[PDB]
Amino acid sequence: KKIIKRDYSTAPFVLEKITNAIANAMAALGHGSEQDAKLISMQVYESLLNNKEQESEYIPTVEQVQDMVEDKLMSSEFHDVAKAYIIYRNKRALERKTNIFEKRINLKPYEYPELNEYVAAIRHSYWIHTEFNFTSDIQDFKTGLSEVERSAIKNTMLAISQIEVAVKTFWGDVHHRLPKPEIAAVGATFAESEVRHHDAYSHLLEILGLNEEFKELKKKPVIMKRVHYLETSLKHAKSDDDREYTESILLFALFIEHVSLFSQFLIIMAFNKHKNMLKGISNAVEATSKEEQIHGDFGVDIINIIKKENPEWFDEEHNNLIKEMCLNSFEAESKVVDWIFEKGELDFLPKAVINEFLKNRFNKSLEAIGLEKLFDIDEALLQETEWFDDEI
Amino acid sequence: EIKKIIKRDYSTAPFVLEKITNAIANAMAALGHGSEQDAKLISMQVYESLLNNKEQESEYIPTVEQVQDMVEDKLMSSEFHDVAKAYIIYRNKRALERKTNIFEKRINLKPYEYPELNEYVAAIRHSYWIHTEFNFTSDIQDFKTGLSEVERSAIKNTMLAISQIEVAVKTFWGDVHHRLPKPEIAAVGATFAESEVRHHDAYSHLLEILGLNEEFKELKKKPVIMKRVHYLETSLKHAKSDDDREYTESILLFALFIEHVSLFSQFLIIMAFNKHKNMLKGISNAVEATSKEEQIHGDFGVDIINIIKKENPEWFDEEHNNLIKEMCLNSFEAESKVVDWIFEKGELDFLPKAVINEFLKNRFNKSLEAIGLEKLFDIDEALLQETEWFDDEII
Amino acid sequence: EIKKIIKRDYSTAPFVLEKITNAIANAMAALGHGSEQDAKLISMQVYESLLNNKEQESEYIPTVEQVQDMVEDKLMSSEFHDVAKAYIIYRNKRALERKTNIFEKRINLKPYEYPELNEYVAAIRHSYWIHTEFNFTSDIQDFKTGLSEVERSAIKNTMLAISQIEVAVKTFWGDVHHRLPKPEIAAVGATFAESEVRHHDAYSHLLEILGLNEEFKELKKKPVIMKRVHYLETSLKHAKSDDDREYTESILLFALFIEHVSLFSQFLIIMAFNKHKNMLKGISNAVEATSKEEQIHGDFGVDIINIIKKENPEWFDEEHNNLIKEMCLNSFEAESKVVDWIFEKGELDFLPKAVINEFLKNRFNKSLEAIGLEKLFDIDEALLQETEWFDDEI
Amino acid sequence: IKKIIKRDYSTAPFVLEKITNAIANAMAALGHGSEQDAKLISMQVYESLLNNKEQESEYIPTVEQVQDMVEDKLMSSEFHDVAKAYIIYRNKRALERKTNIFEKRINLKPYEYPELNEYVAAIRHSYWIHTEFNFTSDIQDFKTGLSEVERSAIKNTMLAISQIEVAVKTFWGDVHHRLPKPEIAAVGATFAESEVRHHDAYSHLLEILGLNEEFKELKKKPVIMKRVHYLETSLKHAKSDDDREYTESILLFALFIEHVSLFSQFLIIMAFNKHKNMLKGISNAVEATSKEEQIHGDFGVDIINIIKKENPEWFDEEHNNLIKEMCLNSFEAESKVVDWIFEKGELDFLPKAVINEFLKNRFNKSLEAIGLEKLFDIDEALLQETEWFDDEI
Ligand SMILES: Nc1ncnc2c1ncn2[C@H]1C[C@H](O)[C@@H](COP(=O)(O)OP(=O)(O)OP(=O)(O)O)O1
Ligand SMILES: Nc1ncnc2c1ncn2[C@H]1C[C@H](O)[C@@H](COP(=O)(O)OP(=O)(O)OP(=O)(O)O)O1
Ligand SMILES: Nc1ncnc2c1ncn2[C@H]1C[C@H](O)[C@@H](COP(=O)(O)OP(=O)(O)OP(=O)(O)O)O1
Ligand SMILES: Nc1ncnc2c1ncn2[C@H]1C[C@H](O)[C@@H](COP(=O)(O)OP(=O)(O)OP(=O)(O)O)O1
Ligand SMILES: Nc1ncnc2c1ncn2[C@H]1C[C@H](O)[C@@H](COP(=O)(O)OP(=O)(O)OP(=O)(O)O)O1
Ligand SMILES: Nc1ncnc2c1ncn2[C@H]1C[C@H](O)[C@@H](COP(=O)(O)OP(=O)(O)OP(=O)(O)O)O1
Ligand SMILES: Nc1ncnc2c1ncn2[C@H]1C[C@H](O)[C@@H](COP(=O)(O)OP(=O)(O)OP(=O)(O)O)O1
Ligand SMILES: Nc1ncnc2c1ncn2[C@H]1C[C@H](O)[C@@H](COP(=O)(O)OP(=O)(O)OP(=O)(O)O)O1
Ligand SMILES: [Mg+2]
Ligand SMILES: [Mg+2]
Ligand SMILES: [Mg+2]
Ligand SMILES: [Mg+2]
Ligand SMILES: [Mn+2]
Ligand SMILES: [Mn+2]
Ligand SMILES: [Mn+2]
Ligand SMILES: [Mn+2]
Ligand SMILES: [Mn+2]
Ligand SMILES: [Mn+2]
Ligand SMILES: [Mn+2]
Ligand SMILES: [Mn+2]
């Protein structure tokens, strides 16, 4: 009575669909007739009937029906039709496969409609800094935070602005190498969120009087070693080779988007969760974290589409490079944290707790692709930042 | 005496003789020929000649460049000939370095070379909308049962015409930073690019809910649409060119004619329909929001063209102005034919083709005039006044 | 009774039944259905059906593909249906992988995919020439105290027209390996590129010694030349394109019309002069040497197009074929105008424009026919016969 | 004043009318002054030049000294506007006369670097095909005439040459993309075709010597993998879109790859024929390849010196330490290739010590050619043993 289609949907069983598929294979070779096709269809039907005998819960698949058609054509006089059927079916199956790097003729239907959720995610998360009030935050600096706390916040703000207050064009340019309408939609939507993040942190540098301090940040050794791993990771961002460009997406989504700013997002939101201070800045950092989580997630999905389509590319040589880069990302981010707390650590958020938080983020990134974790974790120290992931 | 000076930016400032002395002293120090005492002597000569021009002849304010020309003249009249020559060369080199090039990348993020362009990001953030904010329930009812066959055919054709531009992959603005590598331009491009994602989603939804998906796939086979695709593709011929001059022609025709005129006859039809018949409420709200964002898109293009013209005036000769004028006529011919096709089953009493055609002719003239070019069409101000309400709702 | 087999490379080899047995056993091993014993039984059936063909043919020799079709047929007739299906798919997959793609890079240097293309390197090594090998002394004497004003104007214009193409930077052949990344194509590219340096140096020297350097700088302003530059640039529109189908149009128009027809009216004019008037002995020698090298250049391009057509037949539709025929006519119109300009001061009695025009029309038809297209020009066989000596000199 | 030094440093007869006309043209351009005024200014320039000659040090004026003098007299005169316009026009003409190797140009002629045309003439002169040589004697020398030690050394030397030569080589043929000059395009295309000839020659030698199978397996040898590593590192930026990165590739390629990588192997084959009077055919082919490799590296040295002269800022201590670092890595790997060639034993007439000094010296000459200091200490006695090699080339 029913059939499971290729898209896993159920549809009413129509024997004429089997008859016509056989008749078309027959017509293509000039061997057989509508009468012969009807006979073969019945043989296929009688066989399906016998499968409902072994199991009452059985409903045939389109691929099970196809395998059966082929088997009956091999058992018949129409061997040339059987061979042509096998080849034709296999050719259509190969044509139905997707290539993320290849352009398509038609706009609709989408090849990866699940990616449309990323446009909806950013439209939901959409924010402008002008929606927040930084008045309490300015006062927290004037008459509520200690020299040690104010140095840590200043350094954290500067570290976020290093990445955020810049020209960011990776997502906006992703459609040049992944030429899909659904990816272009995501790319454009993410590019604009990067304009909003720039405007937020550029405003915060202004109102906090950190503009001069920001221009001189590039000359700091800790920042130069950070710029070095960031630029190394984006080495192939403009490459014409699809495998080289995949390395850029990988390191960018997994480590840049998902770990580079989160030691800093943690610090600002720690001050707020703990002391109920930095209200406006915390709101802006939380909204950034939410959009950064969406950015990294899309990258993880893109990598998994690439891996599924080109599994050969993901060998031991590739996996050792990712693990090499992951460690260099950690060592550089750990030294950024050391610089943030140059004037002293915070009793409520020590460097040890921040370092476990980073190590874990890097492991989750590795695990998201299908790689084994790189760091051993102190579960007790990690539990101290469980509140962060509950809020994002 | 001399109390004021006109600066390079044409602003006025109090006259300070030490500024002339220091400029001369620095030229002298660079060569090791002359002293502050000699510089002071030359400054006075410059000052005395500046007075001879003022109260003595026409009651003027000297310019920084008139001062510079005078410094050079006194240096040549003095013993410091090597200083005179070095001053001439340094001044000219500083003049060249001071120029902005929209096509060249700059070293530092701040200061911005074109900070006026930042207003376009603010404009789109203000005009920002998603179709999910509107309710198209009444519109679906109007279209399926509430419209006459003449009205329905016109609306269907208008919707299809908007969708052949809007329901497509649009990456021009998102890619503008490749040839115009400025942070402030990159910000505008990204914001405009996302606005096109929203425009696509809106008209794609409208094709779905109005049951026009099948008529949309078959639209490409229509002669009027093929003729439209032809001028649109001709206009974007150099959109991916590596020559800055060729690429400028693409920005020009795209901003001035594609962004400012191609969809506006259709935008006018939907607006006039709601205005007179109080129908197509949701679609009207969506068309109005698209019109506002298209006006912003074309405006940015106009500004970009005027920056390019100011920096490369040689590129904008009579041969290139005749090409724009010709393409403007081809854009009008094709859009006028689109309007004829929209009203194939009959014209609307409240909005005749004659009123639509004057509205288009005027939009094309404003585009030409916005770029310092001569108007192309002669306008009947009476037929044009019938669509004045449209420019009220967009501004 | 079956002693030989035709292999895939069309070579004949002794028939070995164990080769059939092992192919069946590998398909059987891959699925875990059957045994070596079952494979030998299927082999015997295959051998038996091959003999039935020998009964009907005569000295029937099976091909590897006929043996393959037979293996499949016996597997379908047997209990091993899964093995028959897997054999069909594997054989077909292996055949698809064996196909060549001119635009794709290969892993190994040897074996060559197109070894016939190596002949072009040998062809140029044979035709290789430097202008310094010829003597232009008699030519300088002819060009002053030997030619009439009509003859001298024609020669100067012919030389200038040749130089319009030859005295320039030519990098198409040298850059062909970027889009057709084959070692054998890279060899031809480099060899053809150097020949262009030799062609440039030749015509640049002739402009110097004939005192045509000033006339050459002001040739670009001539309407006939601007019209020529227009079709030449249109033809090379996609020469640096990143799309393989667009780039193929550039190779096509370039090899077929630019290389094989653009300079040939001029080559014919100079040759005619040495043949009939017995003059310009040095210049005729260089022109003949260039003609032979241009014929080699266009020929390689024709071979490249035929490889592309064989591999992507879908690309060569009616829309494509109408563009080639459109461009072929524009090439002819522009070249016919060039001939009119060469003879602005008067035609030559031994070589009239009508004879030159039939010569061109025919060259364009041969180009079209070389890539399997229809002959586009109406030919006066009598007027054409007047220049058959040229082709009987390349 | 009888003669003047021109911009190209050539001497020419002094003509005062050349000064008069330059002044008159500056005057004519503004409509300020006359030929009479130009003549007066010319004389002032002449008189001041005369003051530096007969009266001072028997000097010869240069075009730029005459130009500075013209400007000085114009500044001393009433024509301050033409004095200024002269200064600007002279400086504009001087800026236009500057060359940028990375930039295109409107006109084919005149050439910016006409000295580079000599490289096309050099290759046309050195042009050869392997079909011109007779390898009959060589084939038998290899099968039956060589000892086990000698045979192994020749086989390894041939395989080492072929590692570089039997391959697709497109660097020179692609140089015009980043150095877009007609004169560079001419050398590049000429050099690219010579590499096709080199490929055909060593591919034929692998065939006739029965080394095709040993060649396919050569890639798996640790010494060869180590060699491929420095060669690929050196050509890291060969396809880069940055002019400074691409310059590093040209540098390492011309100086070390072209001028040194194959020269130990070229020396082995030459020395063998010289001493043993065997491998006459192969020696002829090797000598012809050595001659064309010397031309290839020389053009590269000239290109680097043009780049250095135009962008001196690029050649700092950080850059120079990288070249010296890469030069040592090239030497280490090449010396390892020498050890592998003689794995079955050294040659009495050509020991590894003599080959190693020969290499060290070649690397020093490369460094010195682009104005860098040497790196290796040389044993002049061991080096003298290979002076015949440089005489042959
Ligand atoms: N509803 C059905 N009832 C019975 N057999 C079916 C049905 N749908 C598909 N099949 C089987 C018959 C053939 O063996 C095979 C392919 O048939 P076909 O008519 O092309 O449908 P389909 O599943 O490929 O979808 P589509 O209509 O989009 O091509 O699947
Ligand atoms: N020309 C033919 N030669 C051989 N078999 C054929 C031919 N035409 C149809 N068939 C058979 C084999 C196919 O699996 C079956 C259904 O046909 P068809 O709908 O065209 O393809 P399909 O179901 O395999 O894939 P798809 O739905 O992606 O088009 O009919
Ligand atoms: N206020 C002034 N009073 C008199 N002369 C002035 C004044 N400002 C500028 N000048 C003249 C003096 C010199 O000839 C020439 C350049 O002087 P300078 O001190 O560099 O100022 P400026 O106009 O270039 O501004 P800036 O501070 O941006 O360099 O302009
Ligand atoms: N090093 C120098 N050599 C020669 N002339 C000099 C030098 N320094 C200063 N001068 C002269 C010429 C300059 O036009 C003038 C003012 O100097 P400066 O402010 O540095 O340049 P400027 O006003 O022309 O341009 P800008 O202010 O835009 O950099 O003084
Ligand atoms: N000499 C032969 N005698 C009989 N059958 C043969 C012979 N050579 C090939 N075949 C048939 C047997 C199989 O059906 C089919 C493929 O067999 P196979 O052993 O792979 O040889 P081949 O022709 O593909 O060459 P290769 O050894 O390079 O793979 O061809
Ligand atoms: N793994 C297998 N699954 C199914 N059939 C197989 C398998 N291995 C061998 N065969 C069958 C089908 C092949 O055509 C035949 C000969 O095998 P094979 O030499 O590997 O391929 P082939 O001769 O078709 O192509 P080629 O020689 O070019 O690789 O044996
Ligand atoms: N032979 C000469 N005798 C005297 N002055 C000369 C001579 N040649 C050049 N000069 C001086 C005069 C002017 O100041 C300056 C430029 O003069 P000019 O006539 O343009 O010659 P040149 O050196 O630039 O060569 P060219 O003829 O190629 O332009 O050089
Ligand atoms: N139009 C002019 N305006 C100002 N000075 C001029 C003009 N024409 C000639 N002169 C002066 C300045 C020049 O240096 C000099 C010689 O003229 P010219 O040969 O044209 O340039 P040049 O010798 O400096 O460079 P070049 O040889 O590269 O052309 O005469
Ligand atoms: Mg189907
Ligand atoms: Mg200044
Ligand atoms: Mg096989
Ligand atoms: Mg001159
Ligand atoms: Mn961000
Ligand atoms: Mn981000
Ligand atoms: Mn839009
Ligand atoms: Mn728009
Ligand atoms: Mn040629
Ligand atoms: Mn040619
Ligand atoms: Mn070589
Ligand atoms: Mn070389």
Residue numbers in the entry:
A (entry chain B): 7 to 398
B (entry chain A): 5 to 399
C (entry chain C): 5 to 398
D (entry chain D): 6 to 398
Which sentences did the original study use to describe this structure?
RNRs are essential enzymes in all free-living cells, providing the only known de novo pathway for the biosynthesis of deoxyribonucleotides (dNTPs), the immediate precursors for DNA synthesis and repair. Class I RNRs consist of a large, catalytic subunit (α or NrdA), and a smaller, radical-generating subunit (β or NrdB). Additionally, many RNRs possess an overall activity regulation site (a-site) positioned in an N-terminal domain of ~85–100 amino acid residues called the ATP-cone. L. blandensis possesses two RNRs: a class II without ATP-cone, and the class I NrdAi/NrdBi, which lacks an ATP-cone in NrdA and instead contains an ATP-cone positioned at the N-terminus of NrdB.
Binding of dATP to the ATP-cone instead promoted oligomerization of L. blandensis NrdBi to an inactive β4 complex, with a novel tetrameric structure revealed by crystallography. Each monomer consists of an ATP-cone domain (residues 1–103) joined by a short linker (104-106) to a metal-binding α-helical core domain (residues 107–398) and a disordered C-terminus (399-427). The tetrameric arrangement is completely dependent on interactions between the ATP cone domains, as no contacts are made between the core domains in the two dimers that make up the tetramer. The electron density unambiguously confirms the L. blandensis ATP-cone’s ability to bind two molecules of dATP, which it shares with P. aeruginosa NrdA. The two dATP molecules bind in a ‘tail-to-tail’ arrangement that orients the base of the ‘non-canonical’ dATP towards the fourth, most C-terminal helix, an arrangement made possible by the binding of a Mg2+ ion between the triphosphate moieties. The main interactions occur between the last two helices α3 and α4 in respective ATP-cones. A hydrophobic core in L. blandensis NrdB involving residues Met80, Ile92 and Ile93 in both monomers is reinforced by salt bridges between residues Asp73, Asp76 in one monomer and Lys89 in the other. Interestingly, the dATP-induced tetramer leaves free the surfaces of both dimers of L. blandensis NrdB that are thought to interact with the NrdA subunit in productive RNR complexes, which implies that one or two dimers of L. blandensis NrdA could attach to these surfaces in a near-productive fashion in α2β4 or α4β4 complexes. Two metal ions are found to bind to each of the monomers of L. blandensis NrdB. Interestingly, Tyr207 is found near the metal site at the position expected for a radical-carrying Tyr, but it is not hydrogen-bonded to the metal site, its hydroxyl group being at around 6 Å from the side chain of Glu170.
